[PDB]
Design a protein around this ligand. Structure first.
Ligand SMILES: C[N+](C)(C)CCOP(=O)(O)O
Ligand SMILES: C[N+](C)(C)CCOP(=O)(O)O
Ligand SMILES: C[N+](C)(C)CCOP(=O)(O)O
Ligand SMILES: C[N+](C)(C)CCOP(=O)(O)O
Ligand SMILES: C[N+](C)(C)CCOP(=O)(O)O
Ligand SMILES: C[N+](C)(C)CCOP(=O)(O)O
Ligand SMILES: C[N+](C)(C)CCOP(=O)(O)O
Ligand SMILES: C[N+](C)(C)CCOP(=O)(O)O
Ligand SMILES: [Ca+2]
Ligand SMILES: [Ca+2]
Ligand SMILES: [Ca+2]
Ligand SMILES: [Ca+2]
Ligand SMILES: [Ca+2]
Ligand SMILES: [Ca+2]
Ligand SMILES: [Ca+2]
Ligand SMILES: [Ca+2]
Ligand SMILES: [Ca+2]
Ligand SMILES: [Ca+2]
Ligand SMILES: [Ca+2]
Ligand SMILES: [Ca+2]
Ligand SMILES: [Ca+2]
Ligand SMILES: [Ca+2]
Ligand SMILES: [Ca+2]
Ligand SMILES: [Ca+2]
Lengths: 206, 206, 206, 206, 206, 206, 206, 206
């Protein structure tokens, strides 16, 4: 396990071969989750890119956080999709947290500490446990079939995941940088593989 | 009575059947009132929605707070109506307080602690005590005939009602949060009934 | 003498019958004055309205502070007008102070504590002491003949009048609500008479 | 109400006359509370001092937060006391939060975002709502009988009070300076009287 | 079961009455185990206290983790005891994991993710499955004869037990927080009885 | 001398007769200078106007600071000119400092304490000492031939001149109002003669 | 070595002759560098200009920091280019730090303390140490063939160079102006040669 | 004046003759001030020494900052003293800022960016304008009677003085070396006279 604190993955060119694969010894299917991360890219005005892609063999888009050009964030679970439209986009590092709960289907989406309106997605679904989590690319098969037009170029880091919906009070602590313990995917205790050109560099964001 | 402090009702899908009904111990009819609430919705740029509907068996719009698209707040009492123009809207939780006095008909409208100009509405009228108070829907009959196109989608909370006009100083403490005690309808001690797809969640707004 | 502190006159409808008359204890003709006030109205984009109207039996616009649509503050003395043009008007309570001095004709206009450029008007003129001072209406005779399309709608208050030019240091303490001692017309000890639909309410501006 | 944000009360002399009294127009007796405040003094090695004194007519020490020489924090409700021993102290501003709940009697003490062990005090008690809240002095009758040897010297500020136990996640947000809404006593909306040599100055702490 | 996630048991007073009893589904006898728990108490300087007490009808100290004053952690299995001396102790929540393997008698002790030196205890022994597990008290019969001077005061939580020796890589995830699945006793699927004055509260530690 | 501190000249009407003439106790020819003055006018969107016109018997624009409509500050020395283009003009008092040095021809221009980029003008020139210095008008002979279209309207004050280039730190104190000693032209010890409609009033700018 | 602290080179006219040649003591070829400098010019809306031109006998654009009109910053290493496109620019002094590392080819660009997204350029290349470093011109042979249309007009200063990538926290202190020790090119110990019309003046920026 | 930036006065031997006298352009008697300086000395364990000595012909200790052995900083105004005790001292360059305000008598003392607790001294006094400011010695008459046992040995510099209390966030910029413009005594525009064995050297500290 590597402590990536103060470090970010740098994807400095467009390619369909640069990715990092994050490992979770998760054994229970997810009835809820939260995923929080920082990314920095200047693509947002040019084209869409995958921020965070979770794939199971039944479903390449089992959790996907995606930027869609001139729309905003695409959040999708179980292949189904909801949009958080973002008309003004400004070139700065952006922190997001997103939570999903099966029992209500409520999606919470938070950007730089501000909540988006709660929306409904995939109520009653369950996210599979045997999953391939990939950064820098969008999976169209379990761990593969990357599309270069969907790769992230720039920085991603502080990638933390919980198998429960964080309350707003917790997320305020996360964004302010108070202490927290992610129970699914821990940036302080991260197991990952790097493929192609990806670099580990000092994070540009505070 | 239930203490709903720091909780909000979530209306995550459009429907004509998701609503909550609030019970007021209101025996005397109202010569004046104040109602304050937080709501959060994406709809303001898409369509109108009912924020707060108070109906009496003789009058379906006995008090109604309505967002009307490309206009702003429609505030109506006894079926008569006045508008508070809002040309531009930002995606954030919004707190409103509204008060009406029969003896003058003066309406105060407050948004995020800013007063709108006082206006005259239904001077000398008297609001009926026997009322069906509903969140999430627009009612065209006592407790029913909802229109799905008028439903609220998003969050509503801290719904407090006084049978008297709050002073500006009091309204400021409602907004900033200091101590107060509503006497018609009280979020700390609410009686409510929930129908359809409605959830109680931690409030997004501080 | 009524201490109107923290209170304001509310004109909640357009009419040509609602007004209040303020009884200056003046007997010397004014060689100079300052009038300062708070008002709040939505008309500024709809139509012109009288703010403060001072008339004498020879001259109905002996002092007039007037908002003229798409222009700004019309300020008249002795029936002659200068414009303090206002390109963008935004709906908030607005404090003004206006000062005139016969010995030079200089008009000072101050809006929310910022000076407009000094402009000359009516050098050598004299303002009659036997004056009907009216709020809420524009008057075209001594005490009447108001026009509804020139009436004020919304709030007016803190009307203070001095028979001398306040220096900028003093006008600053007026805007900040420091102590001051008006010697022509004192809001903290006002003689007034109300006619038609006018209400005394808590002031909305802090 | 005054927005005291970014400002602190300075008590720059030892005295029995300097105090500020904080008004909390509170309806129900408190079954629970949280009081958070930031303060700075060098007295800690010289003598004890009152930090926050809440009295009712029955009980001069109905809530008291007190530094006790060589012991540390003294926390008392209803005149019964517990100690949070502090063996080593530094001259720095210290932020504290203290929560009490009647239902369990559990006291949470938090210093600079670190929790002290939960302790039991006054289970089943009920703190009176009609209270005199004093800063700068310890009080022994409802509004008075101060002791100069128990006065605070230095700075006190960010005094916020809630009528409920904040969760740990909330308190983290407070200490990090996240957004929050105190519902009893609110630094952004403080109504207070100053007596004696007390000054409002920019806060020394961030 | 109960999901106790983010909750701790609070024992806010010294007594022999307050305890919780935890039920393992354990029917195989233990040839090895790991127990991990997070606790917080101020007793460490005042007196010894029981952290975790596993008893069988034949042996009341079948597994016991005990803090002994001015000595440190006492780990005993089958009545044989070894110590991990702790010369200096600071009041902060402490996480420990202990592992014992019969096939070698090796004891692993981990404090806040730092390993102690491996020690040998009870090689070849076998721990009985017919067990009573108690938190808050030390027990000397199968479920009682508690001693007030040995009771825990403060908080214990995240009590997880495995019938096998966790690897150091695993124990790092337990400390930092990543995914794991205990099979003897699972905090996220806990069966327990509360007895006496015990409260469930938000865990103070992240 | 007259100490004009806290006072400004008021030019309240457009004319070709209102001016003040300033006297320099100067006989050495200027190899360099700084001129600083604060002015306030609304003309800037209507037409150009002279800010500071310095003439010698050989050259009517020997130093001229001139606002030119839709361009900005014309600065001219010895009749040669450069422009400091200004794309957006607020109606507020504006403070300028301009400095010229013969040895390099560098012009510094500073507006409200922000420097313009340095530019080159009249390298190797020298300004005559026997000069007529006029505020309010743009002179085309040694003392006259004014033009109404070029007059200033509004206020001008704090006119200070040095026969050396002030450094940036020095200019910062001028803008902030630190101590300085103007050795060519001193507002605190000014010699001036007034002609026509010109008044001395309290400065509007703080 | 001249300590140029708080001084800037001024290039007040367009020319192909005004330049400053800076000499590094550098013997080992650069595997990485940081160049950061502070400059001020109005040309940005009018034409491109060279900010920092580093050449070697094989390569006239060995390092170039260039402003390209209506595009933004051009950063070139070894004659390959990447663009940090700037949508909008204003007349203010701009501080930039840039860094390049051979091993990864990552380029960092920082403007006024804001990082640009990290980009890739000339991975595996190496910059020659036998270098001519010229401010004021863009050079097309080792120390000459300056294109007048590429000259900088305005100010440049604080030119500091390191043979390594500064971390983000270092670069922050540079922009703050904390302690730093450039080891290739030190403004506080600058070896430089002026040619043509160039002046050294007090720096305009703080 | 001289720009003393990056340079310090060195008093490398004990004497009663080496001093520098600083000339304030101070026009007016001080109702408040701030003084900030860097000094470095090994005397702190051996004996007291004067850091900054301000005298008027009435008063030899009109402002004095003085290290007193085994105690800390004596700060005195008008000859009355307050102590900021410093129990442990470390041999490193020391930056202090001290502030006093007559209207409250509040003294602020800041060492290396840490505020001391605010204290009261000489409320209602006013510091005289005709003053001898001396570094290196303590003066007991207007310009003289130095005591060798009170001389500073070591370095003093960055001596900046304001006639107003700097805000705490200003003092951060002073300590950080952000921009500032002292208006009583400016190290970047110092007027001084050097007496005896005193040298100007590059400052040892950053
Ligand atoms: C853009 N998107 C997130 C809807 C789809 C991503 O690509 P794909 O998974 O449909 O192939
Ligand atoms: C207020 N409003 C007219 C916009 C909506 C009222 O809806 P309804 O009550 O007429 O169905
Ligand atoms: C609107 N106005 C103030 C410019 C002119 C008003 O003229 P009148 O209506 O008082 O006769
Ligand atoms: C409890 N205490 C003794 C530490 C503080 C209060 O003292 P007192 O209010 O009884 O005078
Ligand atoms: C001493 N000890 C606490 C480590 C073990 C014995 O305690 P006990 O079970 O005999 O009461
Ligand atoms: C060109 N100018 C408008 C800046 C100045 C004109 O001066 P003048 O030619 O009118 O005397
Ligand atoms: C074109 N450019 C801006 C990248 C480089 C300019 O220098 P050059 O290519 O003219 O020598
Ligand atoms: C307090 N002190 C010791 C620094 C000074 C006392 O008076 P003096 O030494 O300036 O004469
Ligand atoms: Ca896919
Ligand atoms: Ca794809
Ligand atoms: Ca309807
Ligand atoms: Ca209806
Ligand atoms: Ca009229
Ligand atoms: Ca009229
Ligand atoms: Ca008491
Ligand atoms: Ca007492
Ligand atoms: Ca026992
Ligand atoms: Ca036992
Ligand atoms: Ca002319
Ligand atoms: Ca001319
Ligand atoms: Ca080139
Ligand atoms: Ca070229
Ligand atoms: Ca002395
Ligand atoms: Ca002495």
């Amino acid at each position: 396990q590597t402590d990536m604190s103060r470090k970010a993955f740098v994807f400095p060119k467009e390619s369909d071969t640069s990715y990092v694969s994050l490992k979770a010894p998760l054994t229970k299917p997810l009835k809820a989750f939260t995923v929080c991360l920082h990314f920095y890219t200047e693509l947002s005005s040019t084209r869409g890119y995958s921020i965070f892609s979770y794939a199971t063999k039944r479903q390449d888009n089992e959790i996907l956080i995606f930027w869609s050009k001139d729309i905003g964030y695409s959040f999708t679970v179980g292949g189904s999709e909801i949009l958080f439209e973002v008309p003004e986009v400004t070139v700065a590092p952006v922190h997001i947290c997103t939570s999903w709960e099966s029992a209500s289907g409520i999606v919470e989406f938070w950007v730089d500490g501000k909540p988006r309106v709660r929306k409904s997605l995939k109520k009653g679904y369950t996210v599979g446990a045997e999953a391939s989590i990939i950064l820098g690319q969008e999976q169209d098969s379990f761990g593969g079939n990357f599309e270069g037009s969907q790769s992230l170029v720039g920085d991603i880091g502080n990638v933390n995941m919980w198998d429960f919906v964080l309350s707003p009070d917790e997320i305020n602590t996360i964004y302010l940088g108070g202490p927290f313990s992610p129970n699914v995917l821990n940036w302080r205790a991260l197991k990952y593989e790097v493929q192609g050109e990806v670099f580990t560099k000092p994070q540009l964001w505070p």
